Amino acid sequence: GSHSMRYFYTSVSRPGRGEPRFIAVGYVDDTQFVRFDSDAASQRMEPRAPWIEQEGPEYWDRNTRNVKAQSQTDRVDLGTLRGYYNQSEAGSHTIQMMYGCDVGSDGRFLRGYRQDAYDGKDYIALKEDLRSWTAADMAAQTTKHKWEAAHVAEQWRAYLEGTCVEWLRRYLENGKETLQRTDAPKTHMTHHAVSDHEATLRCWALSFYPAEITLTWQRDGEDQTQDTELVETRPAGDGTFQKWVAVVVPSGQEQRYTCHVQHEGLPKPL
């Protein structure tokens, strides 16, 4: 298991009047720690986590300047790409970019990445090696050459492999108290009858951090899948996650079905 630093950026064009909307949101694992959104009055990168508040005004000035210049770049690019895909300017289109790095547990770098997408589909991505690009189409092939000529990948290799790692390493020190604390889930079963002969066993896992969980049902030692219902992990809304899986079961037979819960916060039991 290891840790991640990740930035999420969305640019939506507003054809009516005005500049497109820019929202940047940065994450250290499952924890948002910052946001910038351009309609927000402050025009400022705001702290979204207790531990990032300790950074002084230089942080916040170098950071507010980069996301504002970014928004200025994808404004120029929302136009360029609409040229590429020959689209009417009366349209609203989006641009999204994910970049970030995964350090392992000993602080050393594992993988870094930066990929974007026009209108919900992959456009250009840096490949695993941080030296080459993946155009998904001929528009993005235009950008790849352009980028290939400007040796930009040298610039991303640098930030992913180094800067990213150095700031992530750091946030996990200032942040230890919560960024390194796993919260094992609070599990409890619920039995909701229906008619006589059927009932539903819903197995809950609640309050866990991080969100990677695996919830499963077994009948008599073997994994039960037919007749089970599972929900997507969902923000409880206080930093922890929730999840549940159920199975329909014959009344009287509830003892045959154990639920098995696997999470990084508890050495997997029953």
């Binding site: 999420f8 949101v25 946001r35 609203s92 919900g120 619920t190 923000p235 206080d238």
Partner: protein
């Protein structure tokens, strides 16, 4: 591309009547991002409802979380009303306590 929002209304902690808790509307899997989500008590809108910051999962789909504080009872009904481009008539998904 477009894709339809998936919705789950739930509370943050086990619902107990008369206790304050939080009502959550989880919207995800959509694209475009433009979406109107409103939490309804007995059919009417709760204003003073907040959402999180717009991020996207691995497939560039956006997700969002909307929440208010509510105190369950047996008499009031609670739900989420989501409207987005991919839907002909907005989906309303009523908060059932057991999910």
């Amino acid at each position: 591309i477009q894709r339809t929002p998936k919705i789950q209304v739930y509370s943050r902690h086990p619902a107990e009547n008369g206790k304050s808790n939080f009502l959550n509307c989880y919207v995800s899997g959509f694209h475009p991002s433009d979406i109107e989500v409103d939490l309804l008590k007995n059919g009417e809108r709760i204003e003073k409802v907040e959402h999180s910051d717009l991020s996207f999962s691995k497939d560039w789909s956006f997700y969002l979380l909307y929440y208010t504080e509510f105190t369950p009872t047996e008499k009031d009904e609670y739900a989420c009303r989501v409207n987005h481009v991919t839907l002909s008539q907005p989906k309303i998904v009523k908060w059932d306590r057991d999910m």
